[PDB]
Symmetry: C2
Subunit: 286 residues, 2 copies
Amino acid sequence: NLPVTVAGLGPMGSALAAALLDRGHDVTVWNRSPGKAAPLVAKGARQADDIVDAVSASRLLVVCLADYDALYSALGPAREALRGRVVVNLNSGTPKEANEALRWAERHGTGYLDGAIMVPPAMVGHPGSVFLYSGSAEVFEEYKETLAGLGDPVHLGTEAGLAVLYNTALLSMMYSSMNGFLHAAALVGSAGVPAAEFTKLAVDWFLPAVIGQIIKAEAPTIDEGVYPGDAGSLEMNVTTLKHIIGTSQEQGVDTEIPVRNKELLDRAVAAGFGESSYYSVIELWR
Amino acid sequence: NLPVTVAGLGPMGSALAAALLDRGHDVTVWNRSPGKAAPLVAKGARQADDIVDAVSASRLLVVCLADYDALYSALGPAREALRGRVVVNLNSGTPKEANEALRWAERHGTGYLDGAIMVPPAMVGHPGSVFLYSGSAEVFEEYKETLAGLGDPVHLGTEAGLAVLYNTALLSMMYSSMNGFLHAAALVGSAGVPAAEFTKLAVDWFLPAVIGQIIKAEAPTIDEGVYPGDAGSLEMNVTTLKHIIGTSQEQGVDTEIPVRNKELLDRAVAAGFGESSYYSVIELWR
Ligand SMILES: C[C@H]1NCCc2ccccc21
Ligand SMILES: C[C@H]1NCCc2ccccc21
Ligand SMILES: [Ca+2]
Ligand SMILES: [Ca+2]
């Protein structure tokens, strides 16, 4: 029974603590407010009312505070106790805040890893759960087996802000992809095709086999940064989008999604990228 | 040697004819303009200069005309010859144009299937190639084995415009998904992460395991059309997007993609959908 402390018992922190209890750890729990520990205590956790006692219980401190709270403030009273312990911070807001907390930790003689949880609380500890980490490689090596109880642990690198940045990036990709799916679903839905039908071709096939495979085939060319347009140019795609918009209007389906996508291309054609490949649109954003 | 005619020898039509030649068919080829047949004739094709002779050569007529041309016009001189033959049209512009051509075909005593080619010309006849079809089920059954030489054939239904509509829908989804990926790539790229590195997590894992699986899990709820927001509401996602925008600005990355995604949500919150789930945004578009 390897001791672990969880500081922060919102829905996410509580799921973390429950998962660690299920794996047989000696879990100490702390929260700014009383009343959130009882369900964890009923599962074998010990509540520590004072942060110093919670910090002192364990070398591994798993922190998941509310957004508006701050590690320096929650753990400030435990300054001295933090020396020689490790913070795994699972709720940094931004990359700069991760970097700030790493320096904070260093000043106290505390190891530091930042992590981003890629699943909802109910999925923590279950197959499918992935947690992205950044910061100390040594800390990661020390604790990866314990952290694998929470989700598949992936170390991105030493820069403290890489996990929050990846999370941010993947979510940005998710919002656009989901909108694209829903626009597509509205289009086939104008002909009576249910969304659950449409997913057989859109998700089981097109998403990985077409979108995903083209991204894989194109990514080294992106990194090269020339973007030749001989196999198909950015401006040719403005034509395809005009078509999509016209078909959408014939079907009585809203055109905001394809018109905004056409505007991203018009910006690029004004900047000089029309005869480059589609992927050159990324240069307006870097 | 099963005879097939290909009418239209642009890059796509030429790829179709080449694939059919590779499968051992007796291929007759026709094009409005001379000069595009020779590479196919060198592979075993017979050029027919007159459309009537091309139509009369085969029961199965695979049509892939230029966008600005029209089946009624290219095949008009072959009116009489078309009786008792079959048109597989692989280049309708819109769903209404597909439906028009089906009626056209019916008036002539000609079977009709509309198809949408989901791969580029170089991939026609190769593993990976998928062609979506709509129209006559009988025609499809008659010729699916021949059509499988071109790509995996999928019959969507009897309505003539379903394949063009699916194509339109899937492309709309592709443009948004690709933009999302490229915005994500720009975000991690601000920290020095190459796109080809980023795809290991973004495409091999996140795309299918997260985006795809959530769409599959959510699609029946979409079709139900209630969109309860108890597990997470649309307006909560406006918060996440504000976060993405703020992190993008801290990284020096353009915010157009997440700001436009936030605007789609603001439209929905103004229309009353804020406490519904994210997926309720589709109701503004249907
Ligand atoms: C599940 C929800 N939260 C994470 C990001 C996201 C993006 C698109 C649609 C829904 C959601
Ligand atoms: C490959 C190209 N043409 C088809 C649609 C599409 C959408 C996004 C990016 C590129 C392309
Ligand atoms: Ca409508
Ligand atoms: Ca920049």
